[PDB]
C-alpha cells in the first residue's frame, strides 16, 4: 500500500501510525535522538506490559499504565514512571491510537534512533485497557534473582529471557536509585544498543559513584556508572550467569533475542492474530562502528567470571 503522503507498508491500515511516527521524532525524541526520552519509552514498555498476573490479573501491554496513571503510578516500583507518562499522554489524546499501541510503538521508534538497534516487530489495534494493574508486580533492582526471575517466570519469561530483556539496560540510566547523581547510566554507551552493559556489569566493583547506602545499588566498577544489585546478582547467579556472558561480544545475539523478546512482551495480553502487523513503519536503526571492549586499563583479571562451563571472552582494552 502507499500511503497519502507516498510512503509505503504492506498493510493499509497501518498508513495512520505515519504522521505519529514524524510527530513522536520531532516532539517527543527531540529530532529521533537516541537520549533520555528514547530510553524513558523503553523503560515505559516494560512498566505498561509486566502489569500481568495469571492469578491476580492486568491486561499486559494494553496501556494501563496511562489510562489508569493515578493508580499506577503510585506503586513505588513506578516512581519516576510519571514524567514520561505526561509527556506521552498528549500525543495519545491527539492521535487516533490506543494508548497501549502508543507505548509499544513509541518505545520500538525510540530503540530505532540507537545505533546497534533493532526493529521490534510492531502490531497494531490493542483495544483501550479495562483493568489497571495489580500492584506489586514490577521486578525491583533490591529484589533477589529467585523473586525476579518467579515474577518475569509467571508473566511468561523463562530465565534466558529475562537476560535478553536486560540488554535494555544497554541504554539506560537511573536517576532514583541515588537521587544525587541523576542520569548516571548502567553502561558506558548509555546512547549506543552494545554489548558494553553485558561486560560492565562482569567487572569487580569498585565504588559507589555517588552515595554509599542505597538500597538496591551495588559498588560500581567506574566511576561514571552505577550498577543495581539486581543486575550485579543476575551476571553472578548460576541461574543465569552463564546466558549472560554469551551476550558479551555477541550482537548478533543481542539483537535477535531483543527483537523476538520485547515483541513477545509488546504483545503480554494482546492476540497478533486480531492486531494488524505494522512492523515495517519502524525507522531502521544505525549499525555498530565499535568494536566491544573491557574499559581501558582494565584486564581479564578485573572479571568476575561466573559460568563455569565457559571462560569469559578475551577482549582487548588498554590501547
Ligand atoms: C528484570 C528486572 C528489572 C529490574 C530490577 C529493573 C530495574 C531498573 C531500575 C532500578 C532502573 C532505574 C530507575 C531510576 O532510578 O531512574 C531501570 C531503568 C531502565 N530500565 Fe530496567 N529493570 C528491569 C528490567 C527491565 C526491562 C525488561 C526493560 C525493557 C524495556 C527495562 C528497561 C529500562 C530502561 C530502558 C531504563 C532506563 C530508563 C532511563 O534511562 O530513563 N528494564 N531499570
Ligand atoms: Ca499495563
Ligand atoms: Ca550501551
Redesign the pocket.
Known sequence: ATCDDGRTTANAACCILFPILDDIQENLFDGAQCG?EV??S??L??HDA?GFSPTLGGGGADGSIIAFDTIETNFPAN??IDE?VSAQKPFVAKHNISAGDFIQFA?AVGVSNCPGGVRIPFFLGRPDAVAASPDHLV???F?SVDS?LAR?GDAGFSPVE?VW??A??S???????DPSI??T??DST?EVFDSQFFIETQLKGRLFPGTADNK?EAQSPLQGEIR?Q??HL?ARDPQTACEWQSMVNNQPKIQNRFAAT?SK?ALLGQDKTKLIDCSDVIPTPPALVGAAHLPAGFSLSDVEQACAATPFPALTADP
Open positions: 533520555e530510553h524513558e523503553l523503560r514498555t516494560f509486566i516512581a519516576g514520561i518505545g521486578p525491583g533492582p529484589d525476579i518475569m529475562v530483556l536486560l535494555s539496560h541504554i539506560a540510566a537511573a536517576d532514583g536509585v541523576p542520569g547510566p548502567f548509555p538496591g543495581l539486581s543486575d543476575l520485547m512482551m
